Design a protein around this ligand. Structure first.
Ligand code: SAH
Ligand code: SAH
Ligand code: MG
Ligand code: MG
Lengths: 240, 239
């Protein structure tokens, strides 16, 4: 209730890889040398923030950048911005005329990263909307034409609500476009029907992801690839 | 020379934190999406002496997804074994897609060939039985700019990836992808020394540490090292 925290949360310090040494090797060898100076800055100030556990990591970021470039994405939607690491990643990867619709309930987080976005010279690509994501997506469904469908969506907002996001995004991303769901392995806790001692919010997210992973594997509208990078990323490609 | 598969130390090591997590991914997200003929090919390969070299099913779906997202049409596969990643590629490509597939050992390919045929995609594949570098070098002297590959999957002799790279950054189009398989070498690349390895395993481990450093510094490409399977490094040609 009234009072003032993130180790009432149980999964903060876990990782899906076998050792922290392997993760550090990947980051130091392959990610940090390829990370834009302004992503480095954004990440380092986020690492001191209360919710740094939620930050998209740098090896995952370079993978998002790679996918965006390989598929020649130009119009994207970013749901769950936090301090803007995945958003700046996207903005740097897109061509100069790329356009991003960015949605987050808490703009104060975004203002932490916004100076780095500005210095990188890519703020002009970003339309930031401070809102719960689902009302925005529902309004887009009434607004958008087939000419305006998105090439790519990155989904990283309310971890209990991805299935509802998916029902909108399979209509807002073009045929052949990509929807990426972040955190679909939820620190490994999805591997069991029951799991001990999580925060109620973490447990709701865990069950949501177990149900989402099963549903997406069964969903004829997409083909999928669940990738054990970061905390699990499920790539979906719209078939019809 | 004077001095086998069951001599390797690392074969059963996971890069994920538990076998249960890996099995979850495979049972939930990979096997339900694996083509019947890929399942059949995997099952016979699991029984083979060199099953440890098999590309796993979750990695397969990731390769397939990359191929479709980038609209690849012409590809090269280096290191075929029984054909799992080759069949993945051939199913992913359009009906008129084409693959150049190179392996020193066609007998391995013939294990998977019946499944490739039943999948109806053998016509996309030009299988060359040879060491890869002589083929790649002959391609360099014949390749026309308009025939450059969209995508290359590199999974052959581990100690030789750096030599393959020097050819492939010229054989794949600008904006095209070169994927190197096994770049985390079961996690053993994470340390300067790693006891208990077969001599060939240690050669590969050192080759990958050098390669990973080299690729991260190579201005001809952008890269992303992905902790899927045994590590896959995606390269994108810049010039
Ligand atoms: N219903 C909702 N709609 C939109 N954003 C939400 C939301 N519920 C939570 N969020 C936001 O989702 C974010 C999750 S963390 C996002 C991390 C970010 N992608 C990165 O690159 O690091 C938080 O910023 C939180 O404010
Ligand atoms: N110098 C060389 N040139 C071409 N192929 C080679 C080679 N050295 C080893 N190989 C081949 O590389 C393969 C490595 S295993 C490849 C696994 C396969 N990509 C899969 O999807 O499962 C073996 O079939 C081996 O015969
Ligand atoms: Mg996330
Ligand atoms: Mg391999």
């Amino acid at each position: 209730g009234p009072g003032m925290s993130i180790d009432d949360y149980s999964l903060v310090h876990k990782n899906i890889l076998h050792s922290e040494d392997l993760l550090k090797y990947i980051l130091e060898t392959s990610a940090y040398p390829r990370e834009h100076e302004q992503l480095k800055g954004l990440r380092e100030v986020t690492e001191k923030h209360e919710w740094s556990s939620a930050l998209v990591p740098a090896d995952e970021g370079l993978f998002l950048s790679m996918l965006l470039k390989l598929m020649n994405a130009k119009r994207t939607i970013e749901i769950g911005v936090y301090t803007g690491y995945s958003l700046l990643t996207t903005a740097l990867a897109l061509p100069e005329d790329g356009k991003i619709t960015a949605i987050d309930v808490n703009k104060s987080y975004y203002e932490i990263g916004l100076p780095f976005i500005q210095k990188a010279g890519v703020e002009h690509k970003i339309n930031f909307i401070e809102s719960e994501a689902l009302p925005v997506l529902d309004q887009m469904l009434e607004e958008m034409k087939e000419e305006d469908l998105y090439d790519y969506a990155f989904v990283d907002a309310d971890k209990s609500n991805y299935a509802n996001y998916h029902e909108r995004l399979v209509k807002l991303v073009r045929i052949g476009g990509a929807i990426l769901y972040d955190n679909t392995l939820w620190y490994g806790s999805v591997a069991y029907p029951e799991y001990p001692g999580l925060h109620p919010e973490e447990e709701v997210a865990r069950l949501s992801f177990r149900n989402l992973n099963t549903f997406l594997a069964a969903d004829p509208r997409v083909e999928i690839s669940q990738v054990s990078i970061g905390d699990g990323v499920t790539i979906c490609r719209r078939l019809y």
